[PDB]
Amino acid sequence: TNCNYNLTKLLSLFSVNDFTCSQISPAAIASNCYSSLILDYFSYPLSMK
Amino acid sequence: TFLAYAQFNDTEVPLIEYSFYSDESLQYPKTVRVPYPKAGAVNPTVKFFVVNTDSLSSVTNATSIQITAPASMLIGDHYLCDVTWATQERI
Amino acid sequence: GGGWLVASGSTVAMTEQLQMGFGITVQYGTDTNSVCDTKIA
Structure with a gap:
């Protein structure tokens, strides 16, 4: 809700394989300022991309 | 193109057992065991699969x-009682 | 509701590395974009 974020902070830590957006681009998703931010995570196979 | 298959699970199905005597030279009879459900007993379970055989590969489990x-x-x-293909892509 | 609920589940063999998925949803506006103005400092 009220804080700020990096991608050094949690994305270079992984081997990113694919990165898709809607009504935004990944570049923007990294740049911009938001009222709210939601991060869902789970286990999931690349095989079911 | 496709190969459809069934998988049966007899894990909880009771065994019928009976003697097989075989050739005169077999000293101890063989006990044959077969999963066989009798009326009311626990039945096998079935699951159904389809694999695309054109996209198989040695790099990767199908x-x-x-x-x-x-x-x-x-x-x-x-039970699964019938499997019929309708078209190249309909089952 | 009066009937049954039913479900079925499928698996994929675990990979050596472990592969994950991350979904993001950002909300803009309406005058409070504080993830990067009503704070005192």
Whole structure:
């Protein structure tokens, strides 16, 4: 809700394989300022991309 | 193109056992064991799969897509009683 | 509701590395974009 974020902070830590957006681009998703931010995570196979 | 297959599970199905005597030279008879459900006993379960044989590969274990039974079957013991292909891509 | 609920579940063999999925949803506006103005400092 009220804080700020990096991608050094949690994305270079992984081997990113694919990165898709809607009504935004990944570049923007990294740049911009938001009222709210939601991060869902789970286990999931690349095989079911 | 596709190979559809069934998988049966006899894990909880009771064994029928009986003697096989064989040739006169077999000293101790063989006990044959067969999973066989008698009326009312626990039945085998069935699951159904389809694999695309054109996209097989040695780099990668094949992917079998499981096709799941209808809801009216899932609520209790059922069987898979018929498999018929309609077209190259309809089953 | 009066009937049954029914479900079925499928698996994929675990991979050596472990592969994950992350979904993001950002909300803009309406005058409070504080993830990067009503704070005292």
